[PDB]
């Protein structure tokens, strides 16, 4: 289910501070009659690549972006004529190269040396540390050996097709129903192949977009529920760091409405962590007036600011252990938001040890609790590698 649709970005500006070294992008985006969304969806986008990427293509290969082709026996255009520039966005061009890949192109390598160390990178442990490890890609190779004959259409066909990027709607549905946000951080380096800079595909073609651009996307709903509850009494606890923020954005503008409606909201406490509120907090002026409104109770963690300790949401929330197990023992929900292999698993942690301290039981019993409140639908998580 990728029921896509084309449209218009209606705002795109930039959330880090002037001068920060990093970026993270706020993008507004209408929908058609025939979409609509909901807190905690997804909006998938079908992305470009960038030029820099499509003319190191159309460079290794000698070719003009416009010289139109034909192809025929990867989603590819097939017997139809069609220009080098278009067709380059339809494929991914920085993953890692695969081994039929490499064999294509020893099989076209007449510098012996260089076959020997494609055919090197075939090994298991040679293609997990230098391929897979590195994100070595097949155009950096065939940058890397130029006379390697492989030829324009043989890449092209040996690619896999362009994918989606999902990014979490930070806006609710209840202020405008054919309006959505998202909120993007950009990926951006050196990249870890060693071949020069290193650009994320998705995520800086959206940087790079403009009022009145149109975009390709489509609404996307996950398997896993990531609503607010049902009564907006109902104990939140929300940790969302980072562009983690983002689907909690969404809860905030929902809660907000609800109040402007006449329903009591109960409590709701937003766990953000940034490096500084000179660099990257982003949305600090609505989450600041959203917490004098009483639509929630903002804690936040500075991993660098000068004269302080390092501090992370974990951090934060241990401190605050005795309450939030007292709110959960209440009948809270918990979610988290934002970086799945370091940050929420050290975040689940701490809860389950303020858990285990609280209550004076063991490190399983802390386990089956936190199991035991999944199950029951309370532990939601909308994190992302
Ligand atoms: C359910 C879900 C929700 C998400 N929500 C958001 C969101 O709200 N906001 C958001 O910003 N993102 C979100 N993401 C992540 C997002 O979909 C994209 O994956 C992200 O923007 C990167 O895609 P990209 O095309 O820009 O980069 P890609 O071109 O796909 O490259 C991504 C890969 O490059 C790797 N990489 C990073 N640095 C380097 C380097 N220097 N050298 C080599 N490789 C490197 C990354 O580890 C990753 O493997 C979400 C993902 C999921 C699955």
Redesign the pocket.
């Given at each position: 289910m990728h029921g896509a649709f084309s449209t218009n970005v209606v705002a795109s500006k930039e959330l880090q501070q002037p001068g920060s070294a990093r970026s993270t992008r706020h993008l507004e985006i209408e929908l058609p009659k025939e979409a609509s969304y909901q807190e905690g969806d997804?909006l998938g986008v079908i992305?470009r690549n960038y030029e820099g990427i499509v003319n190191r293509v159309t460079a290794r290969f000698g070719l003009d972006a416009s010289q139109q082709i034909r192809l025929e026996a990867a989603h590819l255009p097939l017997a139809k004529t069609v220009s080098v520039e278009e067709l380059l966005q339809y494929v991914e061009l920085?993953d890692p190269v695969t081994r039929t890949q490499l064999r294509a192109m020893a099989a076209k390598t007449v510098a012996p040396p260089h076959k020997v160390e494609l055919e090197a990178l075939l090994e298991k442990q040679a293609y997990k540390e230098q391929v897979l490890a590195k994100?070595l890609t097949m155009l950096e190779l065939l940058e890397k050996y130029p006379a390697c004959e492989m030829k324009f259409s043989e890449f092209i066909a040996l690619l896999p097709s362009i994918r989606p990027?999902?990014?979490?709607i930070s806006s609710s549905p209840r202020v405008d129903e054919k309006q959505a946000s998202?909120?993007?951080?950009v990926?951006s380096?050196?990249?870890?192949?060693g071949y020069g800079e290193?650009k994320?595909?998705?995520?800086?073609y959206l940087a790079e977009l403009q009022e009145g651009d149109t975009i390709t996307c489509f609404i996307s709903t996950?398997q896993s529920e990531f609503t607010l509850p049902k009564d907006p009494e109902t104990p939140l606890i929300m940790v969302g760091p980072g562009?983690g923020v983002?689907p909690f954005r969404g809860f905030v503008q929902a809660r907000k409405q609800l109040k402007e409606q006449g329903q009591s909201l109960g409590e709701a406490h937003l766990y953000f962590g940034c490096r500084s509120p000179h660099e990257d907090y982003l949305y600090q002026e609505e989450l600041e007036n959203a917490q004098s409104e009483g639509i929630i109770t903002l804690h936040t963690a500075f991993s660098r600011m000068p004269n302080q300790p390092k501090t992370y949401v974990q951090h934060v929330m241990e401190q605050d252990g005795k309450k939030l197990i007292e709110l959960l023992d209440q009948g809270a929900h918990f979610y988290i938001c934002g970086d799945g292999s370091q940050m929420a698993p050290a975040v689940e942690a701490t809860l389950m040890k303020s858990y285990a301290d609280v209550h004076q039981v063991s490190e399983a019993d802390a386990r089956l609790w936190l199991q035991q409140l999944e199950e029951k639908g309370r532990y939601a998580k909308?994190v992302?590698a």
């Open positions: 997804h992305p920085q994100r990027r999902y990014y979490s998202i909120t993007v951080s990926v380096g050196e990249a870890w192949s290193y994320g595909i998705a995520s800086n996950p562009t983002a909308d992302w």
